[PDB]
């Protein structure tokens, strides 16, 4: 009787949690596939992650699933010690990956500033605004001010030179997967807090360890535990929600009565669903504005074996590009993150060559691929990231619903919110507990 909308990680783990509690559920998924914004698929001669890729044992929810489904030793680190290239004042500078990481490390010290005062428990991100806050008034003032400041301006205001500004510009075009200048610096500070306030840990957690058997070994594992078949090709068109239950209408017009609805549809796709009554004004403002995830992820194949790292600031097609696989036919597959899905065609060899040409003139693209999540009706974004003001008046507002409609998904997590499968597994599970506790 609980209707779960979406068979991504949040919906899958919510279903398994309800099953443990003996609560009847049904998952309605719009696509002909499960996994959502995690999607492992054979492309260009090997399995590639069209979305979620990296994991770490400091991510509690992701790591427990890795252990559960047999993947404990099935992780491999991305290539390191690459030849680094970065664009700063319209020119390419070359150095070692260590050289680049040293410059980023110094910049992150200033970027994280305040995280120890804001986030003593890094899983209580809004503690500063709670009745339990006991620090000085100036800490709350700076906290609210930091929600209206982007992460690049912090580095500018600290007097770093143009090279470091261009490096963090590139870095946060990837990290905010969108225009970093519209973003909330509090997101970066909480990443620091969850990473022991050290750049190397933050990169170890978010950009190092890959699953040999893909995210699909995890989402297929969870679905394999479910005793109720997932209803694929069943998009939800309408949710009527009240204090004692809900009514869901599918695209085909099927009406399904529910004791509760767990909605995992991301903000970028919520406009496909009619809500009755309308969602609160403050939540609608977030949906209208959207998150700060307008960017895109590409996979590029070049001739030869090349250990390559490239950084480029806005408005480049791609801001962070790195070698990921050395193939048996003398080619290299690289990953890339960009700030603007509309400035690159992920499947155009000419655009992929333009990306590589940002740094080198001697590397030849032979293949390219990707899925433009922002142009995907059922996503409408990449990973969720925060605009100015959305740390304190954004993701947490989706919990302020009186009815039996519950919003779950990575974008509303307390921890590795938006950016990580960890946040989807966190919030899917805890939202199921909200439903369980209410029924108990």
Ligand X SMILES: Cc1cc2nc3c(=O)[nH]c(=O)nc-3n(C[C@H](O)[C@H](O)[C@H](O)COP(=O)(O)OP(=O)(O)OC[C@H]3O[C@@H](n4cnc5c(N)ncnc54)[C@H](O)[C@@H]3O)c2cc1C
The site for ligand LDP (CB under 6 A) is made up of 53-54, 171, 174-175, 203, 206-207, 320, 337, 419
Per CB under 6 A, contacts with ligand X among 108-167 are none
Determine the interface stretch with ligand X among 45-53, 221-229, 321-329, 398-406 (rule: CB under 6 A): 45-53
Please provide residue 240's backbone torsions phi and psi, each rounded to the nearest 5 degrees.
-95, 130
Q: Which is nearer to ligand LDP, 6 or 418 (CB)?
A: 418
Q: Which is nearer to ligand LDP, 262 or 382 (CB)?
A: 382
Q: Contact with ligand X (CB under 6 A): which of 173, 211, 269, 286? A: 269
How far lies 427's CA from each of 153, 214, 274, 334, 413, in Å?
31, 21, 23, 31, 5
Give the number of other CB atoms < 10 A from CB of residue 130. 9
Q: Which does 320 bind (CB under 5 to 8 A by kind): ligand X, ligand LDP, none?
A: ligand LDP
Question: Is residue 373 part of the contact set for ligand X (CB under 6 A)?
Answer: yes
Q: Which does 51 bind (CB under 5 to 8 A by kind): ligand X, ligand LDP, none?
A: ligand X
**Shortest distance, CB of residue 105 to ligand LDP, whole angstroms?**
12
**Shortest distance, CB of residue 304 to ligand LDP, whole angstroms?**
25
Q: In 3-state terms, what secondary structure has residue 263? A: strand
Q: Which is nearer to ligand LDP, 235 or 266 (CB)?
A: 266
Give DSSP secondary structure letters for 102-136: HHHHHHHHHHHTTHHHH-SSTT-TTGGGSTT--S-
Q: Which is nearer to ligand LDP, 16 or 189 (CB)?
A: 189
- The DSSP 8-state label assigned to residue 35 in this structure reads B
Q: Which does 18 bind (CB under 5 to 8 A by kind): ligand LDP, ligand X, none?
A: none
| Burial zone of 138 (CB within 10 Å; 0-12 exposed, 13-18 middle, 19+ buried) | exposed
Question: Is residue 264 part of the contact set for ligand X (CB under 6 A)?
Answer: yes
Q: Which is nearer to ligand X, 15 or 155 (CB)?
A: 15
Question: Is residue 191 part of the contact set for ligand X (CB under 6 A)?
Answer: no
Q: In 3-state terms, what secondary structure has residue 238? A: strand
CA distance 74 to 154: 39
Q: Which is nearer to ligand LDP, 119 or 383 (CB)?
A: 383
3-state DSSP of 376-427: CCCCCCCCCCCECCCCCCCHHHHHCCCCCEEECCHHHCCCCCCCCHHHHHHH
Number of residue whose CB is nearest ligand X: 36
**Shortest distance, CB of residue 302 to ligand X, whole angstroms?**
21
Q: Which does 409 bind (CB under 5 to 8 A by kind): ligand LDP, ligand X, none?
A: ligand X
Q: Which is nearer to ligand X, 7 or 18 (CB)?
A: 7
User: Are 155 and 164 contacting, i.e. CB atoms less than 8 angstroms apart?
Assistant: yes
Q: In 3-state terms, what secondary structure has residue 305? A: coil
User: Are 19 and 227 contacting, i.e. CB atoms less than 8 angstroms apart?
Assistant: yes
User: Are 293 and 177 contacting, i.e. CB atoms less than 8 angstroms apart?
Assistant: yes
Comparing CA positions, the residue from 371, 366, 372 lying closest to residue 301 is 366
Question: Is residue 29 part of the contact set for ligand X (CB under 6 A)?
Answer: yes
Q: Which is nearer to ligand LDP, 30 or 188 (CB)?
A: 188
Please provide residue 261's backbone torsions phi and psi, each rounded to the nearest 5 degrees.
-125, 125
Comparing CA positions, the residue from 290, 292, 283 lying closest to residue 185 is 292
- The DSSP 8-state label assigned to residue 213 in this structure reads T
Q: Contact with ligand X (CB under 6 A): which of 2, 3, 7, 66? A: 7
Q: Is the N-terminal amide bond of 355 cis, ω within 30° of 0?
A: no
Q: Contact with ligand X (CB under 6 A): which of 298, 379, 432, 435? A: 379
Q: Which does 167 bind (CB under 5 to 8 A by kind): ligand LDP, ligand X, none?
A: none
Q: Which is nearer to ligand LDP, 111 or 404 (CB)?
A: 111
Per CB under 6 A, contacts with ligand X among 389-428 are 409-410, 420-424
Give residues in contact with ligand X (CB under 6 A).
5-11, 28-31, 36-38, 51-54, 235-236, 264-266, 269, 272-273, 297, 373, 378-379, 382-383, 409-410, 420-424
């Amino acid at each position: 009787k609980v209707v779960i909308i979406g068979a991504g990680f949040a919906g899958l783990v919510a279903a398994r949690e309800l099953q443990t509690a003996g609560i009847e559920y049904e998952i309605l998924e719009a696509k002909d596939r499960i996994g959502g914004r995690a999607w492992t698929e054979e492309r260009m001669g090997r399995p590639l992650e069209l979305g979620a890729t990296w994991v770490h044992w400091f991510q509690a929810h992701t790591w427990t699933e890795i252990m559960r489904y047999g993947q404990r030793t099935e992780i491999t680190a991305s290539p390191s010690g690459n030849d680094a290239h970065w664009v700063t004042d319209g020119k390419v500078v070359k150095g070692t990956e260590d050289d680049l990481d040293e410059k980023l490390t110094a910049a992150m010290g200033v970027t994280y500033e305040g995280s120890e005062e804001y986030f003593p428990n890094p899983h209580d991100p809004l503690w500063v605004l709670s009745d339990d806050f006991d620090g000085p008034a100036e800490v709350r003032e700076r906290f609210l001010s930091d929600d209206q400041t982007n992460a690049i301006d912090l580095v500018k205001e600290a007097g770093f030179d143009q090279e470091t500004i261009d490096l963090v510009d590139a870095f946060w075009c990837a990290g905010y997967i969108g225009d970093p200048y519209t973003g909330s610096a509090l997101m970066a500070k909480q990443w620091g807090a969850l990473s022991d306030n050290r750049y190397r840990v933050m990169e170890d957690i978010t950009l190092k360890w890959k699953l040999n058997n893909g995210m699909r070994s995890l989402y297929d594992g969870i679905a394999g535990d479910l005793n109720t078949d997932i209803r694929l090709n069943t998009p939800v068109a309408k949710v009527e929600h009240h204090d004692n239950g809900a009514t869901v209408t599918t695209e085909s017009g099927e009406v399904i009565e529910a004791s509760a609805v767990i909605c995992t549809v991301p903000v970028g796709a919520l406009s496909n669903i009619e809500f009755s009554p309308a969602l609160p004004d403050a939540v609608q403002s977030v949906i209208d504005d959207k998150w700060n995830s307008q960017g895109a992820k590409i996979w590029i194949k070049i001739k030869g074996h090349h250990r390559f790292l490239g950084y480029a600031p806005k408005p480049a097609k791609m801001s962070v590009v790195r070698s990921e696989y050395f193939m048996d036919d003398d080619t290299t597959i690289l990953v890339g993150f960009g700030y603007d899905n509309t400035n690159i065609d992920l499947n155009s060899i000419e655009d992929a060559q333009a990306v590589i040409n940002q740094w080198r003139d001697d590397l030849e693209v032979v293949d390219t691929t990707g899925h433009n999540w922002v142009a995907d009706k059922w996503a409408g974004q990449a990973w969720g990231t925060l605009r100015k003001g959305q740390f304190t008046q954004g993701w947490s507002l989706f919990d302020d619903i009186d009815s039996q409609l519950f919003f779950a998904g990575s974008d509303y997590a307390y921890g590795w919110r938006g950016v990580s499968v960890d946040g989807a597994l966190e919030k899917g599970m805890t939202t199921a507990r909200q439903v369980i506790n209410s029924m108990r």
